[PDB]
Amino acid sequence: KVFGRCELAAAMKGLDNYRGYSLGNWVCAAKFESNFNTQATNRNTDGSTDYGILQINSRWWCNDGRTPGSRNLCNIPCSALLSSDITASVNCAKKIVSDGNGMNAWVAWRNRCKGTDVQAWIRGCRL
Ligand SMILES: CC(=O)N[C@@H]1[C@@H](O)[C@H](O[C@@H]2O[C@H](CO)[C@@H](O[C@@H]3O[C@H](CO)[C@@H](O)[C@H](O)[C@H]3NC(C)=O)[C@H](O)[C@H]2NC(C)=O)[C@@H](CO)O[C@H]1O
Numbered sequence: 001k002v003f004g005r006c007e008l009a010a011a012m013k014g015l016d017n018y019r020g021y022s023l024g025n026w027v028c029a030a031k032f033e034s035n036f037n038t039q040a041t042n043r044n045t046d047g048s049t050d051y052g053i054l055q056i057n058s059r060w061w062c063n064d065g066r067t068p069g070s071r072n073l074c075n076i077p078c079s080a081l082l083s084s085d086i087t088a089s090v091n092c093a094k095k096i097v098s099d100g101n102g103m104n105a106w107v108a109w110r111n112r113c114k115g116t117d118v119q120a121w122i123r124g125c126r127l
Contacts, residue, residue: 001084003036003053006125011086013127019097023127024118025109026093030054031121032108039082052081054089054106061092
């Protein structure tokens with residue numbers, strides 16, 4: 001499913017201020033990571049693949065059966081992250097952001113959202 005900006009903001013309300021990260025941060029990250037598409041996938045040079053709305057990596061967070069010697073920290077099949085229901089992605093993201101590096105785990109966030117006015121991403125949305 002391809003979400004709308006305000007539609008996604010409402011769907012990710014459980015991430016608002018999670019670990020000190022305001023909602024605009026998550027919406028900004030989703031936009032630049034997947035362009036709001038739950039079905040987005042991208043293969044990486046190391047052989048791992050990124051899945052879904054938040055482009056969660058198979059080397060650490062989920063199992064896709066083709067990333068040898070990887071971890072499955074969120075204990076889920078990577079395909080579960082492609083669902084129109086973003087719950088699985090939201091739940092796994094919470095573990096990721098708690099792992100020590102915060103939102104820096106998302107390269108697009110680090111490069112395009114960090115230090116910008118992320119509040120603009122939820123402008124006009126009735127939350
Ligand atoms: C959204 C997404 O999938 N992002 C991926 C990143 O998670 C990944 O970064 C690597 O992540 C692991 C797990 O969080 C990092 O290891 C952790 O490092 C912290 C140090 O602050 C430590 O406290 C944790 O114990 C340790 N986790 C465990 C379970 O061992 C690791 O530092 C990250 N590596 C890099 C190079 O930053 C990157 C790299 O695979 O990919 C993103 O797609």
